[PDB]
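PROTOCOL LOG
Step 1. Enter all chains and additional molecules of the complex.
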Amino acid sequence: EKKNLGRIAQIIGPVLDVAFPPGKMPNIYNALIVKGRDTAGQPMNVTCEVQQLLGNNRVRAVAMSATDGLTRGMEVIDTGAPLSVPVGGATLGRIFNVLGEPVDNLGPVD
Amino acid sequence: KKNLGRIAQIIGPVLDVAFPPGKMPNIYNALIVKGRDTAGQPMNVTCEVQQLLGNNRVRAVAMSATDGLTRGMEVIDTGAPLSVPVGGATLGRIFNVLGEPVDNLGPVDTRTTSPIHRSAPAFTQLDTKLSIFETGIKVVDLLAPYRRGGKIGLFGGAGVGKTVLIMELINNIAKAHGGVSVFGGVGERTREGNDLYMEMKESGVINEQNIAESKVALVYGQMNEPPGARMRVGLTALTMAEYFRDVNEQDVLLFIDNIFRFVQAGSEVSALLGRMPSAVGYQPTLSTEMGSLQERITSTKEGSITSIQAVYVPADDLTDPAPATTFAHLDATTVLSRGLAAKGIYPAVDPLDSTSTMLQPRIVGEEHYEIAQRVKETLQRYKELQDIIAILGLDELSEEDRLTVARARKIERFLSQPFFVAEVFTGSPGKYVGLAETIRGFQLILSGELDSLPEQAFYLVGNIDEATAKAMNLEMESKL
Amino acid sequence: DSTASRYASALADVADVTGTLEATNSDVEKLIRIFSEEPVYYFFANPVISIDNKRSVLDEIITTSGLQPHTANFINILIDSERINLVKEILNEFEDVFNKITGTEVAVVTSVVKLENDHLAQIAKGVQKITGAKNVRIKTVIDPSLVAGFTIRYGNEGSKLVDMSVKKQLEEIAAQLEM
Amino acid sequence: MEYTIVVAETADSPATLQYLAPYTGAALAEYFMYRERHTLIIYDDLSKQAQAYRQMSLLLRRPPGREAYPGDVFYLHSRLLERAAKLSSLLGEGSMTALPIVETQAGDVSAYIPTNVISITDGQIFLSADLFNAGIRPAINVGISVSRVGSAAQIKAMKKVAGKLKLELAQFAELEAFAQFASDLDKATQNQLARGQRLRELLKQPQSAPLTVEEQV
Amino acid sequence: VVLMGDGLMIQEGSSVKATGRIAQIPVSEAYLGRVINALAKPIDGRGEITASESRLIESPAPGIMSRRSVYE
Amino acid sequence: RADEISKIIRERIEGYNREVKVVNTGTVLQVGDGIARIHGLDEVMAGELVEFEEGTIGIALNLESNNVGVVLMGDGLMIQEGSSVKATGRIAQIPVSEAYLGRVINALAKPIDGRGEITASESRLIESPAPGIMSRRSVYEPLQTGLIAIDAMIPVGRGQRELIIGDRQTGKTAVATDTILNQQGQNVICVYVAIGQKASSVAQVVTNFQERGAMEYTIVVAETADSPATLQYLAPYTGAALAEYFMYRERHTLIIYDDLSKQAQAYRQMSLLLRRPPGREAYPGDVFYLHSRLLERAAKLSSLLGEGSMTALPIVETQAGDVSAYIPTNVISITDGQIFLSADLFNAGIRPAINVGISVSRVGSAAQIKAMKKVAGKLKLELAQFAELEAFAQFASDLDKATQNQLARGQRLRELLKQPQSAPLTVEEQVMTIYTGTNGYLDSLELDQVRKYLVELRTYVKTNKPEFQEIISSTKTFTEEAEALLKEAIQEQMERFLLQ
Amino acid sequence: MATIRADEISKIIRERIEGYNREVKVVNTGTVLQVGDGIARIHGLDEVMAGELVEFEEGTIGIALNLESNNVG
Amino acid sequence: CANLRELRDRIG
Ligand SMILES: Nc1ncnc2c1ncn2[C@@H]1O[C@H](COP(=O)(O)OP(=O)(O)OP(=O)(O)O)[C@@H](O)[C@H]1O
Ligand SMILES: Nc1ncnc2c1ncn2[C@@H]1O[C@H](COP(=O)(O)OP(=O)(O)O)[C@@H](O)[C@H]1O
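Step 2. Run joint prediction.
Step 3. Record the structure below.
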């Protein structure tokens, strides 16, 4: 969406909590992509979904993939919407992850 | 030291020290208080360091009584984590968890002190020369042989055994044993331990006129303690054994009562330590310090520590996590099922779950092994037919099953033993048995030679020849 | 976010709405030595004191402290909104939030030698190279437990570290043992 | 009446009394113990005592242990029942005999408190609802109830006559339970079963009947 | 602290007064026959039993060696 | 000598070059017998190890707002609580190479036999993701185990993940080590870990290995109950990394997880101490995450990734004969097959106990060899027939031949299922055994002597027909002349044994 | 409420500390905050009844249940 | 448990 860059406040395992500036706070069930600071040097990004507001510009999400190798206080970007998964009629014969990115090394789908 | 501590929040048996923020001791360190009492201030209560709550307040449980203590009363730190005087001085004296003699004789020298918290021994130094020692109690000797130097697991409900068993075991194997022993009395009844001390005096193994002749030392964490003492008297018995393993280099048989008292004292205090409840309600850190206590007891090429743990399963609920861990800790396990002594089959060891890892035929003399597997199969047949004998009558089943039920009934009644202290429950004198004697006895029973005698003839028997004497006595008294 | 840091950010908010951030920092600096002298802090904490006596002696303090009227309002609201048992921690915790929203940052130099103005300025320039504050304030202490020179604890209050000191000998022992 | 003492404590009187009054009984116990006369004590309704302790303890936010009781109830009842004992003659044979009663939860002895107090005490004695229901007054669940003291705290005459009759009654109950679904029981088994039922009749008391020791011998 | 008397009349603001002694119920003779409720109060219209020992409600157990073997 | 040590000292203190990089650091708030909390650390990642002041290493789990919880990898005595601790930056790798074979180690893979330092060059992340579905393949290679019924009824294949959920203290470790010793033949490097046993037991087991010669090619990572919670929490992960790495070096591998119940018990212990809010049966929510990430790490490779085989054979024991306990119902919900090694089935004398009731296999029969189908389909039928119509044995005396003969064959097959402790009986030992069992060439014999009949049978024919051994090992398919030679040897041996 | 209450957001506490003993209450207005499972912790509104219907910016309605110290839960 | 194990016994 916009540059709603907040700090990853509190991480207890796959439960991770992300702070925010008080201007914009994301909605509930809202997908948030974390620019996942990976050990491999590339930004292997991870996603999450907030089913719990904290009120104090702080969200409560869990991440779909492994949250290991993630530090405190990384930035974040919201989608401003729930999980916009690229489904449709063109997605035949392909294997998917949860967020719908193709995984069977046949390249991307529409 | 120079950290004059201050007491902040007295929460039952758990208390706390306010410290000068510079200097604080570490875990398991002693903390002796300047306590007062009903007159004057010659009161000295120790405190053990578990954890430190950040800003100059720590968490510490008192061992002795937590009454009569004020906030801001001063405590004294040591830096030595409870160095307990164990050497040749301890022999024949009932000691406290504070390393204090309670048998109203003079205090022995404290030259041989050692801290109660320490490193468990290494892995590689581990004496495995596997051989059995014998007792003279048929239902464990035939079935589940006791590994010398390992551990023995005695599980039972409250009132099914576990006391006359351990009394007969010390009564046999202490006088059979050239090495010294230790009885820890961790949370048993004070009367029974007193009576043990009287029995020890009568046996002459102490020879209370002489310290150096006494082959045992005593420590009694009785029920009067706050649980801080009840969780450390176990390790006091441990370090009493440990000095005899390392510094004395002689083999020691080790007699402990219920460890379930100890771990439930841990469960009692973990709520108030600032920790949380656990699985079903015990302490969370169960198996960690449980296995600490365990693996600080082993035989490591310098002395042999055979050991007997009388852990009380509550109300025969075998799903309990601490005896579940101790199951994998032990070497030879005997569950003492209540339904047996309910039928009066003293002692009430179950022939089904009970085992050892010493059932190797290549260590037990393979005919023995054949015998044991045969009789366990027989009892399995009996207990599985128990469902339908109370439904179909005695003689619905086939005739092979008939003689099977009869012979199995006779052998399970033959599982008795008149112990040399059971006389306060039988009145018949105590009886000692062999091992190959019992082997021949059980082969002659289950082979079916005296498979016509009355079922009461094989009851409270020393052996099968004694049973034949009782059989002729019974067939006299039956007609007249 | 500490419970204290909520009101610390509140004090940051009033230092935002006015331009007396240095004046309110001097006021909270007066307040930390006011709520020193532990009978004073105990009396104002002391949860059985009648609250009108608290506010009347508080007005006496406000008369004698020389506070801004908003930071004067602060003690009254910390009385009424009952969180009086952590107020010294609030006065401490205003420091870093004022430090952040001001735009500077804080660090500590721990040398064997009292480092001069040019050296501390070069070190603050390297700190702004690695952090990028505005008017980064690095107070110091000169401790002889080190051997060689400057150690930096920067970023947060104690977060990240660089050094050229007794570390160069102790880690030399570590990188000599080599096991 | 001259040698009995009641220390009464009903329920609506507040919980502090319900916690501390058994220890007042312990205080009377300790005094008359150190005055060397033999004195017994019958603690009664300990489930009420543990329950009122649960009330006062949980109302001070000690985080309770297993099944919402506090954990120190073992320490409580140990601190109670370790008091009553028999002193030696050195301090002068001051004896204290204690008999607590505990309400098991509706015929079930597998509840929380009775496990703990059975581990505390020496001997248990069960009142079977089954045997009192069938009319065996009073009902002793024989075989399942022992004494850790054993017969050494019996007179010499009782050991001299019948020191196995607990065991022998257990034997008879076993054989009778097995012999109910039998068909062709031997005259030996017949005499065993019949004399066991004769002993079952011997375990019958008219109530409030004072008996002498020789009167049972 | 826990009340013994369900303190309706116990009111806020009242200072509490210290005593410095553990619970010690007075015990002597003339107890033989009487009924108190944890406070040395004969609650049957009896009167008063004087007493002088007043041993502690919480006391240590007797000494282990001085415990007798139970024969009688 | 000592001067050469001094020059090693000299070359190392010249190797010290005053590296100036940034290190995250913080101060000790509270330690709590396993839990330690420190504040002032942001840039530490999840699951990262740090190093304290005293030398005790610890790993970070929860990155809380105010402080950060670190859990201890050793003995927590010398913690000072006001001292400073620093960070590292590594993700808790373990060094690895070939030389572990026959070595025993702690959870840090550091040696404890004292048999020298393992010359480990390569290393590996502990929290590695499992290989993907595209790297996964099907199963063709049969795994051998030596046991009759579990070679037979639920076979195991190299690549898949079979599980045994026998109850308390009835023979799980035994049959695990029997699979190990049965792998004396092939090239497969089994991986043994032992968790939460006494050290004397595992020493007894590895001395059994020393006797049988397993120590040439085995590996033991034994983490007894002495160790702190985190070591046993991450020890099967270390074993798993060993397995996956050596599988990436194209070798065939299996693993014996010992007491994942103890693993999970340690996990809920340390986690609930760490104020992870508890979930079902006081275990925190990610216990399934732990077991899935441990077990489903094992897979079968891609045959362009090297075609290594990884087979997970773990052990969970359950309180007092239950199915509906928590972590057993989790691991049966996750893994393919299951095996019920029940206590009364052992105590009945079946050596060893296999319930062939609810024991089902998802892979079923697809991993058995071609001769195994021929020898085993009739066996499956006969076992179903005896297990169903078994109770008529009490009057199979009266019953007709079609149930009577069949019940007699069924019970003597149950006697055939008996096998002693640690007798390595590979495929040619057992195909003849099941063959004469299903052909009835012994049903004239009575109900005890069949065991000595069978051992004399297999010894004589294993000495007599090496061509039968060869055509077993080559075809893996019963040709008719093989079965001819088989029946010939059966008639000869039966003749000799009947004449005694 | 013991550790953390939801009447201490920075905006409401700054709105408090901009003046101590001051003007009228926000009797029908306030800031919604900490929206749980339909659980709205709004500050203000010191005339709202017990069981009172409240209307929102989404058009969704709500019902007063727990009129607390400063917020309305 | 104690019932539930015994109820397992009764079921079997
Ligand atoms: N095939 C067999 N024949 C005879 N005895 C056996 C056989 N397999 C196992 N046993 C015996 O059963 C006993 C228990 O076995 P084991 O110790 O393997 O149980 P376990 O549950 O695996 O142990 P743990 O509880 O440590 O996992 C062993 O002492 C062993 O002697
Ligand atoms: N072999 C036996 N012979 C006679 N009585 C026995 C025997 N085993 C147990 N008992 C009786 O059962 C009780 C069990 O011992 P006990 O002191 O209850 O120990 P625990 O409480 O650990 O079971 C004994 O007091 C005794 O009365």
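Step 4. Note key features.
Chain H has one helix and no strands.
Chain H touches chain B at residues 1-2, 5 (CB under 8 Å).
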